[PDB]
Design a protein around this ligand. Structure first.
Ligand SMILES: Nc1nc2c(ncn2[C@@H]2O[C@H](COP(=O)(O)OP(=O)(O)OP(=O)(O)O)[C@@H](O)[C@H]2O)c(=O)[nH]1
Ligand SMILES: [Mg+2]
Lengths: 70, 69, 82, 94, 80, 485, 82, 82, 75
RNA sequence: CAUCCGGGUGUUGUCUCCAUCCAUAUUUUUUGGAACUUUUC
């Protein structure tokens, strides 16, 4: 029953982490679209599971994304 | 727009040469306009099978060279 | 809305261009396609620590061009009008 | 076409392309991460579907380095167009 | 080397062309036909490659060249 | 005196497609195809091959200024004095030419134009035994009469793909004067009537098995083509395959929408009538009663067609033919609807089986080819042949067996003769060639004395394989001669 | 039902409404005629070269005519054939 | 539509050569081609990027991963271009 | 013929051990159960497990792996 | 076998009447899976 887009929608205003084409991320999701571009707050940059820096307010481009996770 | 004419290769075992210098084998069961492949499962090239049937994405295929003539 | 339009409007500009492979390209933009395919004249290719290679005409593809370094003097707001 | 454009704009206002728009409106200094290891600290001027950008007050950050070596380099550029596939993550430092 | 001051690629059809591709090879030959996606037909095509020294050379012939792999094109000479 | 045939090397017409490039196609066996053209009297066969030819060749010496704008149809493939004065076609005559399909790839085609009189069915049997597919040419007015039935039964009997042409559409409106609807009803009655006798298939304008054409006015089209010239602008590309299948078959069109609904709302005509027959009657009736001025505007503002100042003045008929040929271009709808309606796999094996012993093929260097008929061309005589396997060469000594002998099936088995000359049949001329490849029907000189009626032609490398090859059956002539002198 | 085309899509000549014009009945009458008439263009012919009475004796003699004129039809046909 | 595509289609039957992104040249009879250069080939040799060669029967290749295609020089002559 | 979409649907219906390969990334694989379906190859896959490939096992939660970087499926 | 009443086209001259090609980013092309480091030569 649960498709991806609705899951994504649900997960707005909640913690998420993103891997890339590689470095892990960690932040609260602000909003999403059809193309799967992201906008996050309280972004923390997990360099292979090592929080290098806390950027805060960020916007991730879709094509570099690998997966979403809580 | 046009369908990939792989009706010749239907129900035959094919070497799906796939992205990153890898390979797959298996008998061809189906496909679509994006060239995704649905195939009854076989090994990854010494050798080890995973799965009962397998689905390969379109983008990933380098080649699908026919094992059977 | 469209940056394509803006690009088109930029005509006859002597500009540097930067590629996905880092090649610095000094030339006069005679035209650009709707898909960012740059057409230069009086062109000068240099790498990012080695010698230079000059050419008269270069048609560079849109996918390659990372960053077009714009001219010195430019009214941007005006350009951005439809 | 116009209708489509309007819809797109609305989406941007609502969704994940809102923040960037806001930044543009405000014209604050912002940083961009890029595929080729280039931290682009610059003032945004233009914005579109592809996340291509016209940039003023441009200050890139990278490292020309053939191993083992450690150098940190950065250059000022007045005006600079940017392509969107390059962009990984844009960010706003208050 | 000398060449005219064209507007587009289409207007300079059948000119001898240097061509660069993402892999680093250099295809040289006369542009017979262009594309919506910048694919090129080349009349007498020669792939020229450089191993990591000096120019290695291969004559191909009539070649369809995909635009994905094309980086940029340059004019080698005039017609004929 | 006897025939009318051109003997010089320098007077053969100039074939705008570069003959040399055609002969290269012969190397690719899959590329070349054999189409025969058969149909009852005065269905327009020969004058159709005229359209094809004079489309292909650039300058023909046989055109008078008269027949070029012609009141009188130029009949290129006629070729015999007796067939000129008799007004009929008698001995079958083909041509070979390459033509671009609608996708722009060119393919080499051998037309065999058969006679249409039901006493000459003897020479339609040849056109079946040779050709890979058959165009059955039909008069819209005459409909399908019993002889047409026999043509489709003989076609489907010999395992030969079919395509129908509905010819002589000018005779429909310009004579019978049917209202736009009633014509369409008539087409539904014919096309409905021909499917009845084709058991394993159903033809239909959308499946591209049927080509609407009028030869005397020189236009051939298929709804796919006509859609591709004109309606392809208005609608986005991904719709086209959609739109065409929505053209035929009782669906209507109201505003921007296709609705199979009974005809409700206000205005009612079927789609095929709305987008085709109505603008066609507009083409005729305007091409006659309109003034050259407003018409001259319509043709730019719709069909993207321009008219020279010479063309503005002819007559009703010549100017009509000019306008139609000028709208509907050189006939690519025919070439296509022929091209994709033929599958070599399902058929070729079946026929080669039907014409011989049925067995797995002895493919190889060895040459196996079917000698059909001894045809007379202007110079001397010629033997007509189709190459099923092998490569002929000028000067080979080859075995030639009577088909009357193939019921029999070491030394003593050998008749043999040289191959002195190999031509390609071009109708009014004969084009010399060095060698022939597999699957093209060509002409040999010097076999004539080895047989009567059909004969088989083989040259084998090994003694062992000669036991393993198969021979052709005595060819079937539909009518059996009853009339005795 | 399932799909629609963009409105403004109309048969290519649908702009012009009437497919029958006041003259076209007569045009279709001419398009089948014996000769100087179908063409609608031509060149002058010397006055004595227009045979008005030929078409009458090429046709059958009809019926009610007494033998005297049937003989005349035969005579004239004989001269013509010669 | 693309003229290179057309050319490729025409080359059907002929022995085309064919390198990929990987740099693995093939040479064979072109069986079938599509708008997207989705080539099939018969009786095809296959060179590795390093050097070694391998014979193989009926290769399929997806145009995405194709780099450049060599067609025979007879097709230069006619009759696609004009 | 069995289309890919159909196969995906079937898998979803089942809820079976799916083992995904990554595009242009040999060393890593995913192992879970398909929950979602999209027009593209993208899906959501709850109870996923990242795997380092044999040239063990690693902790991982619920994930949607993006359609562009998929390679293999099996279910 | 000829005569006779006619005819077409071409060139030149002369005469008469007038004038100086889609519109748009999520697998086959252009929104890239690129880069960094190291050996041999
Ligand atoms: N109205 C109309 N008449 C046509 C058309 N095509 C041919 N005819 C007439 O029908 C007669 C037959 O045309 P042809 O093609 O020369 O005859 P045919 O097809 O060779 O008949 P067969 O000798 O038996 O093969 C001709 O005298 C034409 O005048 C046409 O398209 N429309
Ligand atoms: Mg005939």
């Amino acid at each position: 029953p649960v498709n991806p887009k609705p899951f994504l929608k649900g997960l707005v205003n909640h913690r998420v982490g993103v891997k890339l084409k590689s470095t892990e991320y960690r932040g609260t999701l602000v909003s999403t679209d059809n193309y799967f571009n992201l906008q996050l707050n309280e972004a923390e940059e997990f360099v292979a599971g090592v929080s290098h820096g806390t950027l805060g307010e960020i916007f991730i481009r879709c094509n570099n994304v690998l997966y979403i996770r809580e | 727009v046009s369908t990939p004419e792989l009706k010749k290769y239907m129900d035959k075992k094919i070497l799906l040469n796939i992205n990153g210098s890898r390979k797959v084998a298996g008998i061809l069961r189906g496909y679509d306009i994006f060239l995704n492949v649905v195939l009854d499962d076989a090994m990854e090239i010494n050798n080890h099978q995973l799965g009962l049937q397998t689905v390969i994405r379109g983008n990933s295929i380098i080649s699908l060279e026919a094992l059977d003539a | 809305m469209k940056l394509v339009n803006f690009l088109k409007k930029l005509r006859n500009e002597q500009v540097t261009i930067e590629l996905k492979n880092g090649t610095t390209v000094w030339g006069t933009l005679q035209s650009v396609s709707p898909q960012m395919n740059a057409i230069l004249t009086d062109v000068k290719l240099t790498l990012p620590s080695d010698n230079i290679a000059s050419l008269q005409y270069i048609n560079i593809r849109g996918n390659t061009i990372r960053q077009i370094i714009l001219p010195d003097s430019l009214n941007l707001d005006s350009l951005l009008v439809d | 076409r116009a209708e489509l454009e309007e819809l797109e704009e609305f989406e941007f206002k609502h969704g994940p392309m809102s923040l960037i728009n806001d930044a543009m409106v405000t014209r604050t200094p912002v940083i961009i991460s890029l595929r080729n290891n280039h931290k682009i600290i610059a003032r945004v001027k233009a914005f579109d579907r592809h996340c291509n950008m016209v940039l003023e007050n441009v200050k890139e950050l990278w490292t020309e380095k053939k191993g083992k070596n450690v150098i940190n380099r950065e250059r000022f550029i007045s005006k600079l167009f940017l392509r969107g596939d390059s962009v990984i993550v844009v960010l706003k430092t208050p | 080397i000398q060449v005219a001051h064209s507007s587009r690629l289409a207007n300079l059809i059948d000119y001898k062309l240097r061509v660069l591709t993402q892999d680093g090879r250099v295809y040289i030959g006369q542009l017979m036909a262009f594309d919506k996606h910048m694919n090129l037909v080349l009349n007498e095509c020669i792939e020229e490659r450089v191993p990591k020294i000096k120019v290695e050379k291969r004559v191909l012939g009539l070649t369809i060249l995909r635009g994905e792999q094309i980086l940029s094109t340059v004019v080698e000479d005039k017609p004929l | 005196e006897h025939t009318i045939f051109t003997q010089l090397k320098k007077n053969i017409p100039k074939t705008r497609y570069n003959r040399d490039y055609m002969l290269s196609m012969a190397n690719i066996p899959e590329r070349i195809i054999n189409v025969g053209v058969i149909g009852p009297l005065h269905s327009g066969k020969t004058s159709l091959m005229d359209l094809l030819v004079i489309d292909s060749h650039k300058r023909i010496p046989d055109m008078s200024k008269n027949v070029e704008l012609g009141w009188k149809p130029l009949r290129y493939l006629d070729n015999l004095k007796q067939e000129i004065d008799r007004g009929l076609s008698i001995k079958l005559n083909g041509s070979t030419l390459l033509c671009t399909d609608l996708e722009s790839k060119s393919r080499m085609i051998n037309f065999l134009d058969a006679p249409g009189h039901v006493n000459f069915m003897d020479e339609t049997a040849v056109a079946l035994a040779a050709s890979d597919l058959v165009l059955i040419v039909i008069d819209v007015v005459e409909g399908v009469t019993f002889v047409v039935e026999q043509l489709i039964k003989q076609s489907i009997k010999n395992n030969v793909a079919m395509c129908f042409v509905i010819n002589k559409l000018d005779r429909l409106i310009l004579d019978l004067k049917l209202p736009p609807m009633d014509a369409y009803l008539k087409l539904n009655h014919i096309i409905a009537n021909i499917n009845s006798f084709t058991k394993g298939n159903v033809f239909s304008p959308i499946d591209n098995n049927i080509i609407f054409a009028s030869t005397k006015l020189g236009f051939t089209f298929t709804i796919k083509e006509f859609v591709s010239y004109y309606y392809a602008h208005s609608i986005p590309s991904s719709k086209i395959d959609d739109f065409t299948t929505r053209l035929w078959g009782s669906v209507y069109y109201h505003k921007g929408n296709f609705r199979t609904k009974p005809f409700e709302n206000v205005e009612k005509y079927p789609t095929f009538v709305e987008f085709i027959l109505i603008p066609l009657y507009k083409i005729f009736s305007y091409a006659l009663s309109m003034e050259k001025d407003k018409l001259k505007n319509l043709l730019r503002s719709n069909f993207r067609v321009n008219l020279s100042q010479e063309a503005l003045q002819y007559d009703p008929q010549p100017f009509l033919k000019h306008v139609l040929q000028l709208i509907f271009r050189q006939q690519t709808g025919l070439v296509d609807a022929i091209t994709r309606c033929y599958q070599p796999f399902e058929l070729f094996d079946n026929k080669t089986a039907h014409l011989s012993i049925p067995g797995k093929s002895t493919p190889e260097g060895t040459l196996w080819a079917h000698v059909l008929k001894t045809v007379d061309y202007g110079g001397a005589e010629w033997s007509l042949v189709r190459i099923y396997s092998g490569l002929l060469k000028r000067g080979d000594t080859v075995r030639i067996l009577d088909t009357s002998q193939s019921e029999s099936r070491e030394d003593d088995e050998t008749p043999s003769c040289e191959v002195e000359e190999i031509g390609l049949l071009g109708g009014r001329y004969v084009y010399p060639v060095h060698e022939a490849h597999k699957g093209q029907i060509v002409l040999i000189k010097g076999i004539s004395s080895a047989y009567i009626k059909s004969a088989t032609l083989y040259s084998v490398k090994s003694k062992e394989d000669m036991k393993q090859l198969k021979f052709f059956k005595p060819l079937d002539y539909i009518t059996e001669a009853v009339f005795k002198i | 039902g399932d799909f629609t085309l963009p409105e403004d899509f109309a048969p290519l000549l649908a702009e012009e409404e009437e497919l029958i014009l006041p003259n076209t009945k007569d045009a279709m009458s001419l398009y089948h005629s014996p000769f100087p008439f179908n063409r609608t263009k031509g060149k002058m012919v010397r006055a004595q070269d227009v045979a008005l009475a030929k078409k009458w004796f090429l046709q059958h003699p009809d019926e009610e005519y007494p033998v005297k004129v049937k003989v005349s039809y035969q005579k004239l046909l004989k001269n013509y054939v010669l | 539509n693309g003229i290179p595509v057309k050319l490729l289609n025409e080359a059907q039957g002929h022995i085309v050569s064919l390198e990929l992104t990987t740099g693995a040249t093939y040479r064979g009879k072109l069986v079938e081609s599509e708008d997207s250069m989705n080539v099939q080939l018969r009786d095809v040799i296959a060179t590795e990027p390093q050097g070694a060669v391998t014979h193989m029967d009926q290769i399929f290749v997806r145009g995405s991963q194709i780099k450049f295609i060599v067609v025979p020089d007879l097709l230069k002559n006619a009759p696609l271009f004009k | 013929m069995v289309p890919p979409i159909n196969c995906i649907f079937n898998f979803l219906q089942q809820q079976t051990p799916v083992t995904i390969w990554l595009f242009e990334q040999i060393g890593i694989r995913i192992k879970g159960k398909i929950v979602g379906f999209d027009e593209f190859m993208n899906v959501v896959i709850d109870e996923a497990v990242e795997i380092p490939v044999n040239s063990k096992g690693t902790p991982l939660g619920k994930i949607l792996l993006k359609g562009d970087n998929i390679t293999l499926i099996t279910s």
